[PDB]
Amino acid sequence: SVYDAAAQLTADVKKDLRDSWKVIGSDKKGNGVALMTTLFADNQETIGYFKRLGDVSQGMANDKLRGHSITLMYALQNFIDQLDNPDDLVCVVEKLAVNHITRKISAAEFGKINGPIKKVLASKNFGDKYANAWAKLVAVVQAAL
Amino acid sequence: SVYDAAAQLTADVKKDLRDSWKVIGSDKKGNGVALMTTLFADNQETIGYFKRLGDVSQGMANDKLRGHSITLMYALQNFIDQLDNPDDLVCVVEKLAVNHITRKISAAEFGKINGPIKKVLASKNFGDKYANAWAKLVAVVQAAL
Numbered sequence: 001s002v003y004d005a006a007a008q009l010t011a012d013v014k015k016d017l018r019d020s021w022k023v024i025g026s027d028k029k030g031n032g033v034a035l036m037t038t039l040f041a042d043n044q045e046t047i048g049y050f051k052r053l054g055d056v057s058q059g060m061a062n063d064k065l066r067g068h069s070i071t072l073m074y075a076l077q078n079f080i081d082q083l084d085n086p087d088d089l090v091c092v093v094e095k096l097a098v099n100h101i102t103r104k105i106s107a108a109e110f111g112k113i114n115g116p117i118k119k120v121l122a123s124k125n126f127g128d129k130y131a132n133a134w135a136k137l138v139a140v141v142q143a144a145l
Numbered sequence: 146s147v148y149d150a151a152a153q154l155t156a157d158v159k160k161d162l163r164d165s166w167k168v169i170g171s172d173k174k175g176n177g178v179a180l181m182t183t184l185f186a187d188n189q190e191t192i193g194y195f196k197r198l199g200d201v202s203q204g205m206a207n208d209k210l211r212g213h214s215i216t217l218m219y220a221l222q223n224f225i226d227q228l229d230n231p232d233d234l235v236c237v238v239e240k241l242a243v244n245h246i247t248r249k250i251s252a253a254e255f256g257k258i259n260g261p262i263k264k265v266l267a268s269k270n271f272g273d274k275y276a277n278a279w280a281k282l283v284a285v286v287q288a289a290l
């Protein structure tokens with residue numbers, strides 16, 4: 001279950017998530033837009049799902065993309081803040097899952113975000129260990145999809 | 146105009162928002178649920194819009210309501226963090242506005258949250274001065290609906 005997935009994140013994994021978030025979460029606008037632009041560059045097949053945002057190739061200049069990207073970073077902020085209480089983490093994860101289920105986003109498709117996250121982490125010198133930690137958090141959401 | 150509304154957030158208003166947020170934002174789960182339960186209690190005619198959350202009278206015991214409430218507080222955190230840059234505040238406000246326009250929420254009905262905000266602030270010893278500052282922030286969202 002989602003609870004099981006959340007109730008699997010160990011102290012060491014939580015430590016790595018918090019340490020890396022202190023850095024990538026410090027520039028939500030810059031890193032949020034970087035995450036989305038990287039997703040669109042490496043997974044062009046996902047561009048169609050974001051038609052509400054308009055021309056996503058405009059990057060930072062696109063107000064709707066910027067607003068979406070900053071907001072996405074607060075969903076991650078939410079998750080990081082709830083790490084020590086699986087019950088709370090589960091209810092916020094399920095809420096975000098519903099927002100993606102309504103858009104027909106499968107667990108496999110949601111997992112496409114792992115590549116962009118790995119690249120953004122690497123830009124701040126956080127290596128594979130950190131990428132693996134984030135994949136475990138992403139897997140908690142996948143358990144709800 | 147959302148831009149003219151954002152211009153109403155002067156130095157003094159921003160300071161009052163930050164100072165009060167330091168307190169109410171410290172307990173997102175507790176104060177978030179308190180905000181929602183107060184809204185439902187004083188404006189029963191709005192409960193119909195939240196059918197997805199199930200039995201809202203259950204308060205904290207309702208997992209969907211708790212998830213929704215915590216997430217709502219991160220939207221406010223987002224707004225507070227963007228007070229320095231009007232261009233960024235506007236794009237995150239417009240993003241939130243879209244989520245409410247889709248649910249058929251008018252500027253007038255969105256404004257019903259002012260009563261609950263005043264009450265929650267009052268319970269923490271923050272008076273009308275602070276309630277008025279928060280009404281100005283809510284007004285920016287209203288301008289986008």
Ligand code: HEM
Nearest residue numbers: 046049050052071072075076099103105109110112113244
């Ligand atoms: C770290 C992972 C991700 C997080 C935290 C996240 C977060 C969010 C948030 C907060 C929203 C706004 C929800 C709303 O207001 O309705 C959103 C919207 C959306 N997300 Fe994600 N998302 C993630 C990954 C993905 C992936 C990988 C896809 C697609 C392959 C995806 C597709 C969508 C779509 C299509 C929307 C709707 C955009 C719109 O029309 O405004 N998301 N996401």
Ligand code: HEM
Nearest residue numbers: 099191194195197216217220221244248250254255257258
């Ligand atoms: C400070 C004021 C408010 C904030 C920051 C706020 C924030 C939010 C957020 C973040 C969501 C989730 C969006 C999504 O994932 O689709 C939401 C949903 C919603 N809001 Fe608000 N909101 C506020 C006031 C109101 C008011 C006063 C009403 C109506 C009288 C309203 C009606 C709704 C409804 C119906 C939903 C959808 C709930 C669901 O089915 O999940 N909101 N709001």
